[PDB]
Amino acid sequence: SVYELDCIPLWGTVSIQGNRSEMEDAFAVSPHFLKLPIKMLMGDHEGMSTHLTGHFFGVYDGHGGHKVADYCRDRLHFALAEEIERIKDELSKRNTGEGRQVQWDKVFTSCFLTVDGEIEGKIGRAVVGSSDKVLEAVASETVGSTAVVALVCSSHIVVSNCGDSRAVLFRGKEAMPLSVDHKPDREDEYARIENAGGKVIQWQGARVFGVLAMSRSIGDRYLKPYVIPEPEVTFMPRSREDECLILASDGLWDVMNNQEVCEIARRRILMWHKKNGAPPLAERGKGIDPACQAAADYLSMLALQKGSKDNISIIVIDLKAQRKFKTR
Template sequence: MASDPLDPAVPHGEVHRVDSGASSSSSSFFGSDESRSTTSSGEIPTPEACFGPVGWGSASTIGRRREMEDFVDVAPDFISIPCRDIGGCTVELPAGTISGLRFFGVYDGHGGSQVAKYCAERIHEVVAKEWEKGSDGEGWKRRWEVAFRDGFERVDDEVIAKGVAPDIVGSTALAVLVSGCQIISSNCGDSRAVLYRGDQTETIQLTIDHKPDREDELARIEREGGRVINWKGPRVLGVLAMSRSLGDRYMRPWIIPVPEVSFHSRSSDDECLILASDGLWDVMSNEEVGEVACRLLRRHRQKGLANGTLSSPAKAVADHLVKLALRKFSSDNITVIVVDLKSQSPNQL
């Protein structure tokens, strides 16, 4: 029987996964059914696990588009730094405790896939190097803000210098760091990260979409002599439906590669974190996504505990959300990362 072209189990695009650590280091693109369901070796233990380990899973589909332009990057062992450099711990731990950071990225390309793919390959590496350049005297928040800002702009410069893509190609860039006590979000474009917390599924949007009709973005564009034209929704010069991105050099200075960075302390009530391209958010509200994700995560956790299985709830939820967005007639590529903040099982991409 022929494969359903809209089935998220059919890997139309590539998922970039990075696993690095003391014992092994690898970087590969997953592009087959077998690789898309590969399970990692399990949780990576970290001494900072104030609220327990995290699990994760992702799903992507080309959907109703002709080309897959979404990319995912997960670096589960991104960097390890002193807890004080990630905001300190909310529980009492020995002085000098090291905090492990996990990196999750979603990159939604437009005009082509080249910039999104390059971002998935490079941003986590460049941000780590930019953080190392900083100093303790800046304060930990400022140091991360500068690392993300300079990292995104450096990758944007590389796209042009290396001729990665024509000037009309660009990508959103959503990068989220998760430690035992903190969540740091850096966003450029209209991909989105949302945190869900508590039995009543409190919704906390970690990023604000960069849309041309956002009051501050509209003012910035007009100050630079640009215009926002309503053509199938507000667009910069009637072309781009976002006000920030990497690439898109033909739209400078109105479209900029500068991210907004936010900081949120983790809580023992945190359920999950969802990162997704607008293929999901265009057809589902934050609240709808949270209700579905948290309900399924709780069900899978209970089922896994009862059966003693190690299947990944996060992967199952990511798959379900992609299928649900398709049923709601999403017209775009769809990419979802689910980070289970009460994880009891291995991770899958």
């Protein structure tokens, strides 16, 4: 049974300033971090009848400064774990007919909004080391960040997205983006913004008041309620055909498409295994996977090669249990 198998987390990460004048990218990886309630995972068509280990991966592409992306790095997964614990307790007591996608929707919406209110100084926030909560903005009104987050467990990938960072799954031979960029030229977003009294203006791409190229993000109170911190969530059962999952800021996506990124990641992961002995089983999943790290490294080099003039952050995640080469 898939809900019974050991989920060993295999990943690599690169986050560099690149050709930029300052670093505004941040990221967070927390293996074996969450305890996901099976009832939020199992589909209706499956049998009935506690929790699966969940791994957390997040990429935060800051704009207007670095303080919001950093706060997200430091806090967002903890906020999410608080929210899961809440819903987990309600689900143990009551049970609606709530679809899975709807459950994860409310968990991530609350979590993203909580982080956003804390940043704005509207929600009381704990400080590491201190017994006392404070009500105080973490950053000025012009600072914001995208947030793309993925929970991985044995049966499912759940992605929550706010902004134009992106998560892409390689299944079989096809890239499958697991998020849809929040951009003002989306008709739903355009209408949301214009109906709220805002302007979408063509200025090196469609921009909120000509300024911001994304229609959602965490922070950016100067442009509320036009840009909002509300994510969209993708609930994605895994497949034996899945190869790898990539999360990245636009330092990567501006210069390569989804299909070529996936094809390149898979190839570099495979090349590593053809030339290296499998790592010691015991130490696997305790830190970065060298195959994945080689893949993320190569992608960042390629992106720079192709003229990316931005911060580049990439997390490569290997979804194959094992990669052996049958021959003879």
